[PDB]
Design a binder for this molecule. Structure first.
Ligand SMILES: *[C@@H]1O[C@H](CO)[C@@H](O[C@@H]2O[C@H](CO)[C@@H](O[C@H]3O[C@H](CO[C@H]4O[C@H](CO[C@H]5O[C@H](CO)[C@@H](O)[C@H](O)[C@@H]5O)[C@@H](O)[C@H](O[C@H]5O[C@H](CO)[C@@H](O)[C@H](O)[C@@H]5O[C@H]5O[C@H](CO)[C@@H](O)[C@H](O)[C@@H]5O)[C@@H]4O)[C@@H](O)[C@H](O[C@H]4O[C@H](CO)[C@@H](O)[C@H](O)[C@@H]4O[C@H]4O[C@H](CO)[C@@H](O)[C@H](O)[C@@H]4O)[C@@H]3O)[C@H](O)[C@H]2NC(C)=O)[C@H](O)[C@H]1NC(C)=O
Ligand SMILES: CC(=O)N1CCN(c2ccc3ncn(Cc4cn(Cc5ccc(Cl)c(Cl)c5)nn4)c(=O)c3c2)CC1
Ligand SMILES: [Ca+2]
Ligand SMILES: [Ca+2]
Ligand SMILES: [K+]
Ligand code: NA
Ligand SMILES: [Zn+2]
Length: 806
């Protein structure tokens, strides 16, 4: 329909029907005015000034200009000043520190330009260095990480929309490049028009955050047919608008190197040219900023969405080789698998039978099936109706597909892809890049790897915006910035602990427990009282007690070897803290104590567990949070069998936990020069990543009010300088943590019939976690009392130990 784009090319506000459009998305909607190509997508004479064009008479048909008036008009070719005025390319200038923003009059804040590169694997920064001089200059002179961790799945739209919102895909709704929503009864795909509907896109992306707070934002999407040179010239033209019209935040997107990486693999020889071409585009941007005198004013972020792995058609697993009944299912295929019933509302579809048929069926099987609530909690990939209940985690370098005909297409089955991405976000080949350059970033600074969920807060800081609620930890990336506008502070403690003394006689308890503890001095009786009053607490609680950030009733319980915060509501510790030195010795549970459980005279019978419930529950056993194997003396070992240290455990899980406690804790103390361990239960029955309230618990020990944890955590801290013992550390800390699923079987571990030394540690590594993940799941706040700055502690809480090689 009708109108003209004269005077309207790349207008910022999109016009409503029936009026035709002239903005940078009108092509995607087939809604541009008929003269949009003619007026807005000029190409005559290409994108570069030449010597013979210098000072030309302006010819408006040209793609860009070399006329004397072009700087005033804002539409010079980006190399105009170099060719026509003797200037140097930005890449050829020495790095010079940008201590303060150097901006033209009228600029109220440094603009932010986000330059996103699809499929830019982290190791391209080294491996492609010789063909990317502009990017290497941004990297070396600005602030860079060795790599940036994407979100799972490591696909384009989930990651770019995470970058824009600070949200996990399960929260922002873009949970794959393909998705089916069972309420909409509709599917979203990379290609097509359904993804234009705003019903798919949740959260608050940066451009909306900025607009609501009075900061103008350019579009972050681009029509694919608009060439990169024209995207750069358009951004530079917008930067020349009047102050009251000019955006403060801009986004450039490149479909390369991903497009070629799929065809040629991550390091195919064909990949050098796409890297060269992206570098040239960065140079056009920087040259263009330098002409506008903005190159020491704007903050530039150069960021990718995910990496790229070697993947070929022949490395495909077929569900038809496992399932007799493969026509009953629908599979979202590829570098991940998502399975649902082919016929919705079909009652003759059993996910349990499908999982079983996919579990450990072939020795080198290259995927593992999970119910989504059992996936590693670090993936945060379950709380959305668009995530199917059955998930297949696929090994790097592989695909999964339903049937052979899906992969080998007629005529005879040629392949024609060599790279893909989508795998587990800890996989090295999926890691991507981050560089920040400009006045607000630091100068020539390396920062440790971090997660892309953290960047929304930083981008808000760079623009003076208050971030919408999101999954970043605001302050954890303050060390990226020269000038911080956000001062993080610790959350206030909500519940204060009770400190019970001895209040109950043994005969008040009727727990059905027994212990052979009658066995057998004024000197060591005082010592025992001192321990129960907290005399060793500075050894075992090294970073202060955790703060409880919700309303509850709990008790602090001191012992010689461990301290705990015991919930009178959940009838078990929320946390148990203990230090094991490098010199600590492992001992057995003595024979006469195998089934010992002891009432705790500090805690009322009515707020205790009972052994009868465990006897009656034929599926459920128990373990201990402070391990009896690591008692400091035979006398202290009796403390470990208190009813207040006991937690419900399936026998299958006790194999995992006992090996962790008996073998692995001491191994870590040996390797790290002592460790401090905080362990506890987690209840997440609705798999939202957040601590359950008591009325959300779906399973109890039979006949009791003892709730069954869905997971058990541990946080294992030591001195970053391992020449210092964990309990006498002067400097920064080192942490690894896990959130183990509390499962009644070890079907996840295909080698679980072997000795635990052959599979338990592999399981724990898969379920590695950030301290922050545990905080969300428990409502606790750790590291309250250290000598370290709070921003440093926030970085520490977001650390993930991934167990990949370098
Ligand atoms: C990562 O960070 C995120 C962000 O902080 C965390 O997610 C948040 O988690 C909280 C707690 O679960 C949740 O709380 C509230 O949700 C209900 C309101 O939801 C709707 O409005 C939200 C706010 O919108 C406004 O502000 C935003 C700024 O962020 C703007 O973008 C908006 O335009 C608007 O101005 C909105 O964000 C939310 O969006 C969800 O739903 C959309 C439509 O389906 C979808 O498009 C989004 O993608 C998003 O979907 C996610 O979240 C929903 C849950 O909201 C999931 O189901 C999805 O699967 C997906 O994960 C909505 O449009 C509010 O009603 C809730 O209050 C009830 O429950 C609380 C306690 O839980 C109780 O105290 C109340 O009394 C109330 O109870 C009553 O209702 C319930 C039914 O809900 C009923 O059973 C009961 O009997 C009562 O009658 C609750 O306060 C946030 O919504 C959520 N935000 C987002 C963006 O996901 C996340 O936890 C964190 N992750 C981790 C691991 O830390
Ligand atoms: C949320 C919202 O406001 N919506 C829904 C999306 N609607 C839409 C309309 C026209 C479109 N034209 C072309 N393309 C290709 C394309 C991909 N990318 C990379 C990129 C950049 C930023 C993000 Cl956040 C992400 Cl996920 C991915 N940039 N452009 C689009 O996807 C497209 C989408 C616009 C209105
Ligand atoms: Ca991508
Ligand atoms: Ca929960
Ligand atoms: K039992
Ligand atoms: Na097994
Ligand atoms: Zn791709």
């Amino acid at each position: 329909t009708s109108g003209s784009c004269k005077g309207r090319c790349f207008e910022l506000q999109e016009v409503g029907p029936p009026d035709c459009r002239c903005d940078n998305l009108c092509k995607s909607y087939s809604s541009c005015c008929h003269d949009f190509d003619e007026l807005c997508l000029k190409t005559a004479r290409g994108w570069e000034c030449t010597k013979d064009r210098c000072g030309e008479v302006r010819n408006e048909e040209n793609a860009c200009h070399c006329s004397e008036d072009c700087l005033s008009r804002g539409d010079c070719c980006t190399n105009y000043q170099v060719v026509c005025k003797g200037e140097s390319h930005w890449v050829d200038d020495d790095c010079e520190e940008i201590k303060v923003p150097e901006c033209p009059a009228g600029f109220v804040r440094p603009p932010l330009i986000i330059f996103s590169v699809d499929g830019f694997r982290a190791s391209y920064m080294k491996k492609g260095s010789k063909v990317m001089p502009n990017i290497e200059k941004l990297r070396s002179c600005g602030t860079h990480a060795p790599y940036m961790r994407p979100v799972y799945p490591t696909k384009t739209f989930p990651n770019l929309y995470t970058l824009a919102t600070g949200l996990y895909p399960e929260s922002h709704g873009i949970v794959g490049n393909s998705m089916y929503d069972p309420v909409f009864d509709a599917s979203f795909h990379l290609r097509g028009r359904e993804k234009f509907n705003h019903r798919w896109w949740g959260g608050q992306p940066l451009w909306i955050t900025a607009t609501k707070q009075g900061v103008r934002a350019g579009t972050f999407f681009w029509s694919v047919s608009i060439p990169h040179e024209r995207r750069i010239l358009t951004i530079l033209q917008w930067l020349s608008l009047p102050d009251n019209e000019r955006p403060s935040v801009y986004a450039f997107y490149s479909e390369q190197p991903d497009f070629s990486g799929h065809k040629y693999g991550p390091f195919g020889p064909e990949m050098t040219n796409p890297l060269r071409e992206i570098d040239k585009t960065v140079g056009q941007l920087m040259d263009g900023l330098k002409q506008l005198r903005l190159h020491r004013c704007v903050n530039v972020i150069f960021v990718g969405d995910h990496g790229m792995e070697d993947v070929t058609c022949d490395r495909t697993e077929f569900l038809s080789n496992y399932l007799t009944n493969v026509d009953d299912i629908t599979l979202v295929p590829g570098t991940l698998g998502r399975i649902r019933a082919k016929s919705i509302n079909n009652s003759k579809y059993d996910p349990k039978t499908i999982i079983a048929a996919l579990t450990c069926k072939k020795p080198d099987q290259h995927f593992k099936p999970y119910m989504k609530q059992h996936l590693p909690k670090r993936l945060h990939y379950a709380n959305n109706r668009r995530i199917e209940d059955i998930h297949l985690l696929v090994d790097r370098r592989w695909h999964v597909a339903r049937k052979p005909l899906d992969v080998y297409k007629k005529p005879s089955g040629k392949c024609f892809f060599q790279g893909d991405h989508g795998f587990d976000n800890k996989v090295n080949s999926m890691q991507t890049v981050f560089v920040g350059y400009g006045p607000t970033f630091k100068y020539r600074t390396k920062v440790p790897p971090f997660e892309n969920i953290e960047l929304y807060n930083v981008m808000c800081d760079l623009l003076g915006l208050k971030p919408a609620p999101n999954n970043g930890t605001h302050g954890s990336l303050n060390h990226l910035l020269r000038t911080n506008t956000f001062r993080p502070t610790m959350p206030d403690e909500v519940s204060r602990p009770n400190y019970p003394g001895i209040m109950y006689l043994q005969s008040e308890f009727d727990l059905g427990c027994t212990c052979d503890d009658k066995v057998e001095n004024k000197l060591e009786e005082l010592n025992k009282r001192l321990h129960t009053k907290g005399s060793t607490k500075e050894r075992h609680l090294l970073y202060g007690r955790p703060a409880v950030l919700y309303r509850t009733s709990y008790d602090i319980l001191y012992h010689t070897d461990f301290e705990s915060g015991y919930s009178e509501i959940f009838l078990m510790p929320l946390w148990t803290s203990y230090t094991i030195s490098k010199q600590a010795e492992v001992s057995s549970i003595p024979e006469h104590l195998t089934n010992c459980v002891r009432p705790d005279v500090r805690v009322s019978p009515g707020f205790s567990q009972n052994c009868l419930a465990y006897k009656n529950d034929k599926q459920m056993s128990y373990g201990f949070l402070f391990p009896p194997y690591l008692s400091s003396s035979p006398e202290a070992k009796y403390d470990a069998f208190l009813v207040t240290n006991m937690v419900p455990m399936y026998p299958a899980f006790k194999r995992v936990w006992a090996y962790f406690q008996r073998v692995l804790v001491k191994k870590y103390a040996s390797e790290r020069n002592g460790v401090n361990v905080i362990s506890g239960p987690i209840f997440d029955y609705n798999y939202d990543g957040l601590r359950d309230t008591e009325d959300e618990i779906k399973q109890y020990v039979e006949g009791s009010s003892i709730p069954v944890p869905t997971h058990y955590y541990s946080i294992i801290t030591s001195c970053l300088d391992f020449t210092q013992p964990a309990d006498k550390c002067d400097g920064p800390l080192s942490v690894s943590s896990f959130i183990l699923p509390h499962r009644p079987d070890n079907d996840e571990s295909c080698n679980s019939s072997e000795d635990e030394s052959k599979w338990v540690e592999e399981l724990m590594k898969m379920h590695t976690a950030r301290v922050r993940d545990i905080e969300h799941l428990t409502g606790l706040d750790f590291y309250r009392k250290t000598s370290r700055s709070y921003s440093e502690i926030l970085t520490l809480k977001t650390y993930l130990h991934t167990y990949e090689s370098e």
